Write a protein that binds this ligand. Structure first.
Ligand SMILES: [K+]
Ligand SMILES: [K+]
Ligand code: NA
Ligand code: NA
Ligand code: NA
Ligand code: NA
Ligand code: NA
Ligand code: NA
Lengths: 252, 253, 253, 252
């Protein structure tokens, strides 16, 4: 079927996009670097089974994809924003408006653009990649953390209205997901290379490793398959058992 | 001790301010209407125990209360927004922006202006009045529901950094809270007067009544008292045991 | 790879076993009825792809499957109990003991007998089929609701220790799951046939249908596949978007 | 009014009992050491405003208290059990039956015994002291942790049926609550005396300290007051912002 995967080059983008193509889907990909031609074209070259798009705004992209491939069956909102740690008084208020625009407004806008056709066909799936950060927050990341929570709750609240139209809505909240060359949010260096960082991941996850792009993609495809629509409204903590809580002195 | 209560004429404003006042706080009050002198002075007359301010903006308000009454010890971010039910496709994206601005950015901005003063003394109490909507969502309120979750998570998040400075941070998430003459969100009319409304409330809450402004105010005061700082980070569902969920055909209502 | 599915004739038993079988597992099956040879042999005839065992007790079962089929790679603790609605004062304390024994102790005991073998290889998958009741409770089901929460928390708790040995642990908490000819907990009769029941399900779930044994089975197989071990500790609400919560007088159903 | 506080000498017992008396309540106290006479009598001596009881089983104790003081207005189920850390295969199954009997069956049994009269008066409050452990579990405590979760969920599920009779039901889940001389669960030594243990509490709580008996008692009394009945069904995480999650290498 026809899927869209945003910000395809970062975070949960490559896992989701490439696993979806393997499921036989046509996969239109959005990204920021695709406002240029060298970039879109190189990507389209490197990935023949993927269709990059230059469209950059939300509703634009939905119409485009619908014109080119007939409709949008699956939306994977892979949202990203650079986390800046700051004590609350040291942020500007625009920094929180930043986070909210990128991590709540964007997914909202997308679904606002695509819902109508899904509802008329009474078919579609919607996946938000959010964050597990609200489940185990670090101090000094209040902008990023809270905006992620808003996104996850959006997914769950949509599941309630869109179930009537046979449309599942999911949020996937990762943490420690290996993002390979992407700085969002766990690049190979340092997160696999430096002992500092390997020792940390090992301590704070029960499985003692980063999540893989392959695991994220497997979930995304299993969900978008129509195999388990009854999980609608789930938020999935794709976090490897994070957090591992420090135990009492004396115990390993 | 100086409290600030926002949007004092609506939602949890009056219960908070009145009960904080009874506890002994000086209670500085913000409200949209107070940008007009008539309104401001009317309110001060009816409530000599409360201190209405005219300042509308966050930094501007915090500053004014600090100059006037020494400092800000307690912030009650009583945030409001007119919710509008739509299917998602029938909302404008601006309707979400609006909801986030009123329900997230505003408490953020108040904390952002006040936290440094609190952190220097190593004392203060911060309470967001959010909503219980994320806990039992209705269909077709996606914007307000998600934004409220966002503000509740913000309180929890902030509790982790502020703890270091002995500042507890809480979110109170009401539902079915009697709002008296305020339309945000459960006025006397129709919620106490119309039979369909009385019957609805009776079915959907476990206590079968609206929550009172007095209950909300007691909680706000209890949390601001220093009696139980070790709850910091808690989101409180002040919703009377809502939601009651429909049981199988045949079983009593 | 050898799976064990318990109480296979009921609740999520058949969907799990059938789909695990289709995925390629050898599926050893437990059921109360299999302590009788007639029952056991009937079942094996109808399902040549499944392997019914007669062993009833945890250590006894795990042992038998290990001797027969090499080892136990996947445990699906499909736990059941006849729920009885009572106001709390009308229950016996024994009614709670009963519920905890069937819904907590039993999965505990199965994991307790199987975990050492899994931990030596550093591979295995454990799935509890619990319930979504704690997520949207009904009044007057205190025993079953609480015990199910307990088993869901046990899965999460166990995930923290077993992670070290690359063993994911999950809880699937269904509601309104079509159970076919099993009375646990949503049989074809009345849940697909009686008009009041069809209408109830339509109102209270967001998908307006019962969940299918096939959906449950796909999840169980997906989780046992190794495709997404990094979900370990997850409690999954397999309930179709239940609960739908009654909106204000005047708004469509 | 008339309250009951179980296992008064440990965990949340002294805070709750003694704060309730200050609120003007008659407070009957249960404990294990009160199966003896030296113990009950010494306690009754040391605490004139408290009424210890020798009753040891649940329904017995409720009837007793009702005979002596007319009725039971407030029940504070302060449940305890010794946490044993064990990898799952190393427990016996009786060890989990142990935990469940002590931490779920007991509170259930109590409420089973007292509900009728509360429902007939259409007045009463019920408080379970559980644990915040399910909110942030340590590894190797699966018995204790899961049984606590069952208790907390019992409280919330009861809130649904007993609201109709004007009866709030709460659970208070502590962690790091200073229990003074009680080994359940954070005695003064080591938890205030040893630097090892002080440094740990400081790291894992946002407020960087143990909870006080006084804070627990303040909550218990505020709740049993009838001041904020609308919080019914709340589980309260009385944990000081625990857990504090380890941050990335390089950051404090
Ligand atoms: K997006
Ligand atoms: K007790
Ligand atoms: Na993240
Ligand atoms: Na709708
Ligand atoms: Na609300
Ligand atoms: Na169930
Ligand atoms: Na504990
Ligand atoms: Na009842």
């Amino acid at each position: 079927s026809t899927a869209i995967v945003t910000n395809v080059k970062h975070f949960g983008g490559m896992g989701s996009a490439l696993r979806l193509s393997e499921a036989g889907h046509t996969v239109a990909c959005h990204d920021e670097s695709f406002k240029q031609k060298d970039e879109l074209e190189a990507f389209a070259e490197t990935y023949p089974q993927l269709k990059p798009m230059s469209e950059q705004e939300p509703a634009e992209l939905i119409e485009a994809v619908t014109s080119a491939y007939g409709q949008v069956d699956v939306l994977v909102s892979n949202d990203i924003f650079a986390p800046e740690f700051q004590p609350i008084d040291k942020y500007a208020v625009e920094d929180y408006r930043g986070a909210v625009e990128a991590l709540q407004i964007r997914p909202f806008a997308l679904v606002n653009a695509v819902a109508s056709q899904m509802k008329k066909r009474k078919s579609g799936h919607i996946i938000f990649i959010t964050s597990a950060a609200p489940f185990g927050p670090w101090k000094e990341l209040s902008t990023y953390t809270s905006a992620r929570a808003g996104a996850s709750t959006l997914a769950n609240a949509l599941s309630k209205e869109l179930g009537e139209y046979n449309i599942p809505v999911f949020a996937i909240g990762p943490n420690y997901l290996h993002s390979e060359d992407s700085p969002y949010f766990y690049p190979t260096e340092p997160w696999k290379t430096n002992p500092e960082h390997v020792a940390h991941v090992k301590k704070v996850t029960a499985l003692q490793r980063l999540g893989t792009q392959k695991e994220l993609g497997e979930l995304v495809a299993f969900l978008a398959s129509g195999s388990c629509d009854y999980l609608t409204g789930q938020v999935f903590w794709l976090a490897g058992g994070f957090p591992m809580i420090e135990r009492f002195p004396g115990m390993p």
